[PDB]
Swiss-Prot record, chain B:
One of its GO terms (cellular component) is plasma membrane. This is Protein S100-A3. The gene is S100A3. The modification Citrulline is found at residue 50. Ca(2+) 2 binds at residues 62, 64, 66, 68, 73. It is found in: Cytoplasm. Keywords: Acetylation, Calcium, Citrullination, Cytoplasm, Disulfide bond, Metal-binding, Repeat, Zinc. Its main location: cytoplasm.
Length: 92, 93
């Protein structure tokens, strides 16, 4: 089932970054930025979301806390959809 | 072909399939989200220390008929199902 394979892949990617060192259930925002930049390299903002995307990406880069858990990592993916997937171009 | 890219595109495709049925294409009802998780993640079941969190999660969707589940909340529900059902998180606090 396509959703099952997709959700298992999102956990695999998290394990790949969070398992590097330290607490296997957490990332630093620097690591989350590296993950999104490398793993979603081809994704770019839609027409009415460049500002929001840029602000989102700025916060990760400035922010150097290390309490990003799995749920927050998946919420970052959801946000990148809103910003970068055409389905949501007109979503309020 | 990057595995995360294909996965996140698939997550949006499944949302489109349910939310595009009728009404507002950006929202689901909790009844629709429970149908989605039951059909699309049919094989996933709770880990050793999460059965009661899982069951409570599933019972809230079934009781609560609110038609404000947006995309972000749908994805949060997938994340919660990971915490409950994927062995990687068996010991996560």
């Amino acid at each position: 089932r396509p959703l099952e394979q997709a959700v298992a892949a999102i956990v695999c990617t998290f394990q790949e970054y969070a398992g590097r060192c330290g607490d296997k259930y957490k990332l630093c925002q620097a690591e989350l930025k590296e993950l999104l930049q490398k793993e979603l390299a081809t994704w770019t903002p839609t027409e009415f979301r460049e500002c929001d995307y840029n602000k989102f990406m700025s916060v990760l880069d400035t922010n150097k806390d290390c309490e990003v858990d799995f749920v927050e990592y998946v919420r970052s993916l959801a946000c990148l959809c809103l910003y970068c997937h055409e389905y949501f171009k007109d979503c309020p």
